Design a protein. Structure first.
Lengths: 722, 722, 305, 83, 84
């Protein structure tokens, strides 16, 4: 009977009569509310106690069998329940985004610190009491929907502000510049970096011939190549990277005064990155690492938190720099123009349905609000036409603003009608001006908030031509290079050398290092050596760029110079087996909890382990299923029986070797050193903390961790086999 | 001027000025409501006092001008306001319906007279106190959108019942049978009747070679061809035609017993039709006649009302007929199986937005509800697949049930997810069986309303073969013929003759006429004569079918033998110019209103005319703008100046000649007879009412109108130049 | 036997042992050009071929679904039925948002003398070259199945397939348009199109919203005059004028710009219907202009402009 | 699924999907129609002498094997499957 | 807005002018809201007074003296008519 039951209608109950699973945001954080989420409640489905039905509302009695001509016969065309279930499934998929297909979404809110009326009339930047809702999607660039999170790529960062005066979309990246200057080159650049069109190889990688062929022939790309070749290209979390709108925008105030503006997002949890070998392994054992990290951090209360910052330039200072502020391959150095922190954004609710919310969300740089305006940046100008154009195919037509995640929370009356999947039913005149409805809805005068374009002077000739002022390809790459710590420079050389290693045609590699000789002679020579290229005497004498408004370095372009390492919310592995020391774990956990750090007990099997004190303690998962690359640091408590089993276990001995090679902090209590001493690992350096007392060993352990990575270990780490 | 310049600058002031036009149903009849219309209220937005906005909620300040470089310069790509407005316009159109593209909809409600629990468990048929909302779309078949209403064609009649146990679609036609027997022939039939593939000619007509080519080679089509050749093919109004589901369905009661069922709609306003010459002129001067007639019926309170009837056949009687009840080219004569009137449907509210509601509604025969089931009609079986398949591309994907007009008014939880334009947001398990949500939504046992298929026996071999019980093509066409009055038979001969006259290939005309010799010899003879064909004496004695289950004729297949002529809601033209007798008009008007007739005053100009008594009378429209084909009858009041104006007006004199030739009633008061006597018309017959006192004459006029048309005049009228 | 024959597979001849309109390849096969020769690669010739599925499988019985017994239920495994029905279900594509109602023909263009003085445009350089064209004529307001002889602007779109690119001259049969700035097109078109609550009227500007918009926008009056005149109701697409409306530029080999407006001047003259006659034609032949064009080409009275 | 994945009912006209043999029938139109057809688009016709034509089973026309079918209309898992 | 409507009107033969009048009169006669017909007829008084008077008569509109005295546009680069 037990078996027969499973292939018959299921009228009975099936439920049985870290610790907890990820759940929809409405189930785990229902108290994190905002105005947009309340609007989305109108479309949420609560199925408790409901019948299974067709889409026309008809109750289904047997969801286990097709209508057949007998129990062993042929399926009947009149089985409308079967066909409706299969047809819906057949049409589930919609096109992925042409770029940034791979992405993660969360809900939140934004508050302005104080009014910015001095700069902009934008409603959401006027009143610090308002909680204006937001939805953010983070993304990679090159890979399709199912590619890995921790690839070496640019990360996209798109924030939708549901304001009372319109929806504003801030659509940026995690590096302050882009690869190209004119939007007309976007298909060329994207085709070059995407998988090649004959074999569709490789996925989520720029490490191939067509990409570097393009770089080598378009020096304007070099600056942002530097950024992706650095550890910026492999962030540890979406909570620990920076954000930039990249383009110079405009803000107009109540007086009609124009300020040029560049947008910034500064992480409250600091700026931290992976290292390349650890990033690549993480894509094998968890392609969802960033998506999972963001989701769990919100369910844990370590809400992503970012401060919106603005670089502000008076319209008269437009030409005060050695670069064009309209050139998206140029950053504005924070020395020259400081970033004013103007408000805070917090992400505190996961979506309920990924496809409905994250997949269907539409962001366009053209979605501005009164108080913001566009500059003549010729890359931004192309983006204004592309976002809306692509969303008509991806999202089914021109009514994609009626999709719940995309609706504004303000009114939005106009004379537009019809289109595919038209939701609203409009009774009134559909042309303007009309008299039969007394011309409602009516144009809004500027003094009442109607959008106007700032009247910027426009002079020249109709021409296709790159501005003379855009022709500066090497200076900002050099600024970025000289601004990096020694270990960050080595990692940039690593990225270049690994990537060009996968390039088949030699002349592309040669042309690329040749481009590097115009940035820094020692960067070019390091990369040339890793690739067997001998530089000529002429190449070694290649002219280098001078400073930029008297600047040769800028500390802000470095990650590990200004000690932007936050300890709250990091993850620590605790390698325990049966026979571990109970009191140690408690004191490790109490110390970690004191610092906002999460520790996870990893054991050979799942469930519980029993301590030498005879008590049972819950495991978070196996050592095998949670390698060191998923945690920030390892700690091994004492317990002779625990240590003995760990030493027989290849995964747990490798756990420490790999933790070591990836420059992480390793804590060893008591005879735990028994395990370190067994491996081919050198004498404990500054990131190896031994000790017999757990709270003290934990306190010192948490303090090695404040440095993120033991950069000193790097040279001896290379020679360790593992 | 300063007013001139004003028209092309933002319009911030009022445009309105400080018998009625057609209006949305929400403006005209807000009192008429039901559960479906209350649901649609959520999707209706009021624009009064509201700003013109973008779809993102941004107030627009200038709707009159593109963003340009200079007031005489080039248009700029950053004008996101212009591009959004134009892009939405650009994507307004969706594919029209592949058949029945030309249609018109209305809202209403349905009530069952008493419980049908003896025959079915269908919820909406159990409880007379329940008001089930409906939406009904009427249509032609062949024409595209924009084709004319009063073509000679089959009329579609689709009714959507929004019940509490699911949405039920009764998708019918206005004739009791269809052209073909098997769904695999439908594309061939449709391609044959549609415009021809090389030149896309003719629109709205079956009168062309390929259609009659298909008929001559497919005799199974002859029965419905007789229906559409008769006056049933040109109905006067959607309120005055019959409706049929055509197929035999099944009804299943609580005891599991099965009754074979056929659905009927009986119009309380009667069954009446135009004549061919009138129908064709009407397509010229009002292609929207029926769509307008329906709209204005509801606004005038002349609501379309119909009784739902059932022919009810116990299971064991299935094979007691001389034809197969599963054959869709066969009707079940009402003399054999009567139609039981089981309920009433009232259409009492026009839509607000035609596209949102009439264009986007989706109906399928497979959308049945528990208590109803399908039969093995092989045409019906193929229909179940077609309606959902066409809608996935016509309505933009598999979520077209989430478009407001298609949503059910009951719950509809299931495990379907995603698809284009996904409105719902679901959090719970998306598979069945599941334990992580205790298997909600859950399958419903049949005794809780779970849908089940009645366990009909199935025996045979897999094969493609026409059932021998279907090969019976001339019986029912002859039965239909013999059931017609001689006037109706004459018009059938006219339909055939006119249509075949437009076929170019003479052998097509000859082969059709040969098919007619197997239905009736006089019919074949009369059509042959009009086509210049000579029949052999062999053809004049081709064997004819005999009676069907003891009937040679059935008066219910006739329109005019019956007495279904309703005078209320008909239209009357009152021809008048200045100097008309104003007391006469007032008395005519009072009389017409007494019988619910609508008199419209048609003059040589709009505005007002002036009574010979010096009074102003408001005019409905011009004589030239409202020819006699638009009204049911004509009455000319007295006033010698009016009659003398009307006598110099060629259109006014054509009004009487045309209405005379279209067999309509004409009243002439006093000197008005002077107009009639100058026309080359014979002596007043029974349809020409002459009289001096206005009310007296109007009374006799209304009585003549009770007969619809003056059939006796037909031969006299052929001679008349007009 | 004859009766049953019609519901069984037809493996026999059906043709019998003043002339209908026919596809261009059957009536005027000698009239050819480079474009038509290119289209030939996509013409199917079905004489002597088996009826087949789209995957190439021969079909034995096109008269019957696959059932469980001759009186039974249709089976889901009938792939032939579902392929044929599915393709029928998906025949329709959206109509053009304006000019939905239209009529097309192939032809050629020749230049009289080189226009090198004014333009470098390849197709206006060499008089010995026949440039293939395809022309579509249309109304504006009505949907696909609306009548021909309505009162409306007529669209007149010509595709020149030149050796240096496809050039499209997309014009009307009046020399001016109703509005000045594109931002107003959706308002103008919405005002003229059938009204949104009832979708009335078809193929007519004679309704409130259109004239409401005219009354508030005097820039429309010039073209409103053209369509209230007998320009609004032409006798034939062969007897109307054509215009690009807009000023274009033409650039010669020396970089010199001239302002240009385009004109089509019909060789068969400019003739129109009168209003009452045009309205009656829509009733008794809604395809009148479409038919007239097809038939004039078939008779040798080629449209020339 | 392929009607929406590949853009309509004419995906067999995409080169990789086309057969290498003839495939005449009466199907017409649909999105991105590449074939251009002049002949009658319905069957049976006489204006084209009914070409293209059904093929007898003995000349290659597809037929279903006449398998016997006996039972009741039913939603049920075969007991012969419970294993 | 009015100069070229007047040029086009003055170029028409009298029968072509009569047909323009019929076009306006028939179309406006199907407009329901009377103020729309009036506003349009008013617009015509700025093009040609006899055009406006004929159409206003067909629609039963009485024109005011201000309307019959509405200022008309002048020649276009010397032209008042163009027979093409
Ligand atoms: C300043 C450099 C650029 C940045 C920072 C940028 C940023 C982004 C981001 C973050 C997304 C993903 C948005 C999401 O999550 O849905 C995106 C998508 C996209 N971008 Fe860009 N982009 C840039 C340049 C361009 C250019 C030059 C074009 C082409 C003109 C372009 C066209 C697109 C398109 C078509 C999408 C997909 C939009 C969708 O399907 O919803 N972008 N961009
Ligand atoms: C009993 C004979 C039939 C009747 C009475 C019938 C009735 C109708 C009606 C009234 C409509 C218009 C529904 C609406 O207003 O939206 C319609 C549409 C349609 N029918 Fe039929 N039909 C019949 C046979 C067929 C057959 C044999 C097929 C093909 C298998 C078919 C396929 C369709 C399709 C595809 C539509 C368009 C549906 C849409 O786009 O929403 N019908 N039918
Ligand atoms: C100078 C005034 C204009 C003229 C003479 C004109 C002419 C035409 C013509 C002849 C067609 C039909 C082409 C065909 O046969 O396929 C057409 C279609 C169209 N026009 Fe215009 N038009 C004008 C203004 C506009 C404006 C202002 C817009 C909007 C910005 C517009 C948008 C369209 C669109 C969307 C179509 C349909 C194109 C298609 O679906 O293939 N036109 N126009």
């Amino acid at each position: 009977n037990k078996a027969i039951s499973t292939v018959e209608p299921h009228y009975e109950d099936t439920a049985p009569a870290g610790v907890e699973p990820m759940m929809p945001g409405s189930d785990k954080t229902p108290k994190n509310r905002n105005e947009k989420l309340t609007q989305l409640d109108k479309f949420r489905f609560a199925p408790q106690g409901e019948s299974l039905r067709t889409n026309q509302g008809v109750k289904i009695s047997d969801n286990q069998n097709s209508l057949k001509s007998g129990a062993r016969g042929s399926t009947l065309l009149e089985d409308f329940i079967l066909r409706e279930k299969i047809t819906h499934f057949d049409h589930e998929r919609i096109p992925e985004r042409v770029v940034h297909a791979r992405g993660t979404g969360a809900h939140g809110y934004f508050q302005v610190y104080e009014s910015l009326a001095s700069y902009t009339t934008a409603e959401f930047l006027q009143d610090p009491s308002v909680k204006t809702p937001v939805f953010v999607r983070f993304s990679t660039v090159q890979g399709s929907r199912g590619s890995a999170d921790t690839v070496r790529d640019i990360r996209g960062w798109a924030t939708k502000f549901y304001t009372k005066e319109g929806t504003f979309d801030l659509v940026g990246n995690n590096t302050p510049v882009f690869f190209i200057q004119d939007a007309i080159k976007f298909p060329d650049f994207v085709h070059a970096v995407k998988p090649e069109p004959h074999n569709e190889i490789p996925q989520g990688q720029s490490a191939h011939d067509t990409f570097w062929d393009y770089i080598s022939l378009q020096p304007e790309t070099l600056h942002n190549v530097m950024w992706v070749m650095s550890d910026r290209g492999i962030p540890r979390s979406y909570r620990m990277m920076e954000g930039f709108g990249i383009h110079t925008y405009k803000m107009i105030n109540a007086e009609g005064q124009c300020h040029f503006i560049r947008f910034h997002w500064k992480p409250v949890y600091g700026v931290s990155s992976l290292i390349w070998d650890e990033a690549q392994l993480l894509t094998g054992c968890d392609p969802d690492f960033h998506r999972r990290e963001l989701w769990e951090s919100i369910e844990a209360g370590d809400y992503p938190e970012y401060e919106l910052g603005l670089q502000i330039i008076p319209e008269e200072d437009e030409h005060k720099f050695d670069f064009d502020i309209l050139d998206p391959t140029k950053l504005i150095p924070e020395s020259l123009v400081p970033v004013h922190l103007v408000g805070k954004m917090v992400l505190n609710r996961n979506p309920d349905n990924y496809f409905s919310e994250t997949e269907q969300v539409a962001f366009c740089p053209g979605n501005i609000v009164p108080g913001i305006d566009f500059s003549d940046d010729p890359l931004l100008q192309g983006r204004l036409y592309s976002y809306i154009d692509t969303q008509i195919s991806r999202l089914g037509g021109v009514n994609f603003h009626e999709i719940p995640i995309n609706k504004p929370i303000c009114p939005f009356h106009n004379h537009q009608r019809d289109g595919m999947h038209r939701m609203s039913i409009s009774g009134t005149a559909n042309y303007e001006p009309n008299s039969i409805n007394n011309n409602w809805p009516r144009e809004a005068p500027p003094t009442e908030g109607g959008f106007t374009t700032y009247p910027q002077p426009v002079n020249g000739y109709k021409s296709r031509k790159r501005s003379s002022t855009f022709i500066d390809f090497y200076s900002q790459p050099r600024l970025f290079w000289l601004s990096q710590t020694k270990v960050e420079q080595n990692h940039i050389v690593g990225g270049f050398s690994f990537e060009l290693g996968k390039v088949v045609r030699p002349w592309i590699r040669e042309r690329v290092v040749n481009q590097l000789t115009y940035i820094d002679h020692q960067l070019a020579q390091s990369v040339a050596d890793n690739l067997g290229i001998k530089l000529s005497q002429e190449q070694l004498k290649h002219p280098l760029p001078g400073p930029i408004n008297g600047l040769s370095k800028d500390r802000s372009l470095s990650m590990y110079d200004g000690h932007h390492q936050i300890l709250k919310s990091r993850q620590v592995a605790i390698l325990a087996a049966d026979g571990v020391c109970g009191d140690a774990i408690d004191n490790i956990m109490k110390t970690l909890k004191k610092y906002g750090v999460h520790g996870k007990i990893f054991a050979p099997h799942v469930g519980r382990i029993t301590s030498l004190q005879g008590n049972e303690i819950e495991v978070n998962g196996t050592i095998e299923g949670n390698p060191s690359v998923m945690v920030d640091a390892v700690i091994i408590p004492d317990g002779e029986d625990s240590i003995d089993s760990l030493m027989k276990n290849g995964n747990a001995k490798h756990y420490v070797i790999q933790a070591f090679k990836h420059l992480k902090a390793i804590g060893l209590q008591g005879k735990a050193f028994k395990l370190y001493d067994a491996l081919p690992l050198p004498k404990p350096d500054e990131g190896i903390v031994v000790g017999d007392k757990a709270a003290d060993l934990a306190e010192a352990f948490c303090n090695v961790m404040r440095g993120h990575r033991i950069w000193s270990r790097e040279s001896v780490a290379q020679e360790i086999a593992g």
